[model samples]
Target: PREIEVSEPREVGITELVLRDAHQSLMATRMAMEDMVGACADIDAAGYWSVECWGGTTYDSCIRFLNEDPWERLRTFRKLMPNSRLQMLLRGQNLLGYRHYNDEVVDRFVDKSAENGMDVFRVFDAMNDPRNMAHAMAAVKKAGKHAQGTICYTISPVHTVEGYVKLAGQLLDMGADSIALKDMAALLKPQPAYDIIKAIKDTYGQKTQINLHCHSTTGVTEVSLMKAIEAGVDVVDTAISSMSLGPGHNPTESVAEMLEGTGYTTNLDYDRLHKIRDHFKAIRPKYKKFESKTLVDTSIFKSQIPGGMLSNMESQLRAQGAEDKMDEVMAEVPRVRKAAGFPPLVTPSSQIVGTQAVFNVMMGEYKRMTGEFADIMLGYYGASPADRDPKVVKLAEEQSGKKPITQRPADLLPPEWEKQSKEAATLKGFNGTDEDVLTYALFPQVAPVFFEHRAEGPHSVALTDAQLKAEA
Candidate 1:
């Protein structure tokens, strides 16, 4: 008999339901709070392990506008779902000064959240400036709760492997219970994903949990998710196929199904997932236009079609004055991908394919650069202006002369004074003392010209030549 090998089964779990989605849906349609709460109840009954609430700019602004009274809403929700773990997003800079809160506003907020049933606090800075880390750490410590240090991809430029390592280390050091890679625009490349996961695991390992939140903006969600799983990431945020729009976003059921076929079990009720998907589809029309051609392209590309190549093709087509034929250009994506030896867009290596497609687009841009004066000007202005303009060169040289004008360096003339003088002729009312004249002539601006030119007028008096020469 042949030897048989057995592998441990992979288990999938729903970590939390994102309240941010509900907030966005409500804001988009001005839906009532009761309706939003009703939807939350449905999501809760469906067996989501937890619920995350209160994120984005509005959430931060509300803290000040409502005088912290909005927290009562979280308390109310906690009463509804006592078993579910609650989470809140905290903004560090939104708090009142220490005097009002007894030098512990952060502690008070954390206590209030805990009292309201929040088990985890997902905190982030909009700009991700390192100075904000201390405040976040203080809040987490004061709250005595689990903390998720969030990295919002795209806006912060953690696109490369080295950048992720530095940021990850900073977050971990700030006392994050876990690391959440939130790629808001779905701009994460596959190789960079692999690099980030490997580095995080090697450094932090089982010490901290790593969660990935991808948006569907770029149409690479499936490939990126697959790569994240392969790299040993713990949790992934996803929606349903019907709901997945672009890069960082995904349809939860679609991903669950894909994982199931690959021997991973999510434990999610497919029937319930289907119901949620269908319900959203019916309710979507009452809210806003959810269907976008760009979003549709992302979905198609994530489903294994080479639709991601359309962007590069569209760029080229537009450059050729054929932007009206976008449909025709999009239709060429598959053929172009095949001709360029690129793999399907949903492959775990889609970043490699995307790189090749974008390279061709860049080449097209490079070809157009030669026809523009802006390109020539940019080239000439490399680092400094003295190299291109003879007047600038002369001004620099004159300042370095043997009898340099140390007392008043502004009075010195440059090597190409004649050229500067010719250029200065274009301007009228160019009057000033010798020092003022040189300043006006060198700078050639109204403020410098007016002050310097006025100083050089006939009403101006000069020191005796003997004294001036002696000083020089």
Candidate 2:
């Protein structure tokens, strides 16, 4: 980790990744709000650039899997961790759901997220499409929270140094408070990352902050980070040592140690990080089943599956008694991703592309697909980095019977304030808020069961009515 720098040492801030990426990567997104709130104060006192505790898959998994309301966690975290800026990874136009919602819904969701707890919004699209992020970026500023424009780092023909430089310039022009290089796939090589960071810094380093959010899948994260750090990137994501490695972010303690006395020094007290690491290490047993079964998956260069998502994909196949076909499924994931024009595997798109692969291996190749898969083919989320596979487009259209539209899909929908607000008010719950309505609208199937669970304290709920209905 030693390096000779051309400039004076720069002390950088960290955006701790344990509460979000660490557990989500190692534990299949199963950590309840109760599982994490105890460490909030410790994390807050640690003095990070921010504590990323929400968004990405955290919001949906809260109620759908953990029986806790995402908003309540945010509100509680705000009170508990008052010193640190709370951050969340947002899917821009998608707004934490599997598909795009109207701009009204997107803007309101951003506003409410900020009001609840989030101080920094690391916003990005699956395809690195800036158009999908415009309204969300504007709404984050309108809500008075820091808006961090994110580049979904990938390596397609379209994703290049010049392209990334252009995107960075575009984000700054769009009023971004900072720029986040989100390398969820571990695809960023040292040269590209260093070059991209230097280019952005050289262009606008004085004003715009450059952050690196990367995964450890490729084993090159530490090396690539050294390069970016040399380029004077401001903030980077890291997890406590005990919970780091594999698909998780770079270890906070190790990174700090590596950069010690160097120009990129982050003199975080090792003792505090050890304490946080101890806390999670002790809590690891209860969620043992969700622990990662794979070590380093270099196949990420091909499939671009996020670390947490690769874990989830295996779990889904295990539940279906198709675990033996994992090799086939893994092979098909890249194939499906290719057929879909290489949508970066994140959140809804990850599930979409992975599910299609599952069907390919379990069923037949493109023999069947979920409606979500069809929506992806139709460009419902945002523009693809490349054009859709013609065969996929034809088959998906046949399956969905929906015509592809060129304009923003949100523009085609009726205003959501009137529709979702009216519908959510009629739900049978204990207490209601606009945020609750918005959550319900985003996840109608799980929201009713979530409401009942919150209101009456039910523990026997297996799945939402919509899910049970789907199984039936």
Candidate 3:
């Protein structure tokens, strides 16, 4: 008996994170904008849901690490990848900086990001605070970009499926264009993912476009990823194999292959996928310095340090001639994380906690703390998920006579749109673009160096050590 089975068309979309996150996670965020623009033509034609061309640590890395203009980078990405929709991961009200901003700043950044070519803003707050996410989401929506509200996936006793549903419900009411399960740590297992997705759809159902973004810290995502698809995920983030896996993004090729004939497949061009891989393979050598040394270290599940930050921490250690203490630094993170009330070690906090961990090991426990440490304790960066250690909070209060803030942190910030615009336009190297002004605003310290180098042209970066010393 020949049995004919009919299956529904399960259309899915894959968002490529290579340009922004792949190299950032594997190494540090060292891949220059030039390295990516050359491949954007082919990548834009590769049929991705959206190309994550900017965001994450890209803005900070551009000014502080890569010496490129972050705004110009976004514009260039849009110019090169005209056929594809561009996406960025915004740090909610923080925009690209470490702390929340006045609504004016948030409003302008989102508008400029969209005007320069951002199609989607994957917005999240480090503490999972809805209040923190609201301004950015509103700004993104007003700017006409898809506002994908994200969950900063972490495993805490307080974080349950019901908690996620409540969060999603609030975001939905707030006019989120979609929902994002941002499993940055790869800690989201199969069942939990299924439960969350099922509950969301069963409750919110069909209206909210859903995407799952999991780091491949463990090989289990390959298993859970399939579960997510069956659980009715609309989109998933993956990278080309050359730069995928081992604490980076899940490989798109495998995900595409797995979805073959099961009816839940992406629209990626079969031929172009291989070409994109070849393009990245050629340039992969340039980022070897940024690559992760270990593979699938489950220890991250405990430390809660994201894969992207893991590489940067190592890079900072090497710069300080303390590479041998890597294990100690890793061991010290959990202690600092606890003291900080279990803030998910992503971005600003990752840099915050990791820096403190380095300080604790090299300088003794709490003997010294970064300014950011004090800021977090004082609630300048908004409340932690579980609240900072009472002793640390009291110490900050006692030292400064300023109690920790218990309101939206951005309320403390004054509008700077006009002032910064006027100030940045006065710089000789300023490019006479709003993007340039935004660049200077976000990264005040290094934007000037990059802008001066820009004024001097490409050869400035090639100056000999003697020539640089003489200039100094």
lDDT of 2 by residue, 1-472 (tens): 8864433468877889888878888777777666677878788888687888888787777778766778877888899998889999888888888667888888889888887878999888886778888889999999999999998887765567887888888888888999999987778878777888888887776557889988887788878888887877788888888778887778898888887566567747666777787887766666655676665778667655665666677988999995988778888887788777777666667888887898888879888889888887877766777787888888988989998765666777777778888787777782668888887887889888787777443122223345545665
Q: Could you tell me how far off, in angstroms, the CA of residue 392 lies in candidate 1 after the best superposition? A: 21
| Clash count, predicted structure 2 | 0
**Distance from true location, Cα of 84 in model 1, Å:** 1.9
Q: C-alpha displacement of 313 in model 2, angstroms? A: 7.2
Worst 10 residues of 3 by lDDT: 456-465
Model 1 lDDT at residue 369: 20
- How displaced is residue 7 in candidate 3, in Å? 11
- What lDDT does candidate 2 reach at residue 461? 23
Superposition TM-score, candidate 2 onto the true structure: 0.86
lDDT of 3 by residue, 1-472 (tens): 8742222467788999999888778767777666667778878888999989788887877777656667778878888898898988988888887556689988888888888889989999887877789999999889878999988878865678888888899888888999999987788888887778777877888656889999888767877787777777889999988889987878988888988778787888868888889888877765554566767767666666665676777887899896889889888988888888787666677888888888888888777777788788888877777767888777767656777887888887888888889988877688877778878788777767777776442221223445545665
Residue 198 of model 2: what lDDT?
85
lDDT of 1 by residue, 360-428 (tens): 344531222221112112221111101223332333334333221222111131344344445555555
Better of 1 and 2 by TM-score: 2
Give the Cα-based TM-score of candidate 1 against the true structure.
0.54
lDDT of each: 0.48, 0.79, 0.80
TM-score of each: 0.54, 0.86, 0.86
Better of 1 and 3 by TM-score: 3
C-alpha RMSD for every candidate: 22.0, 5.9, 5.4
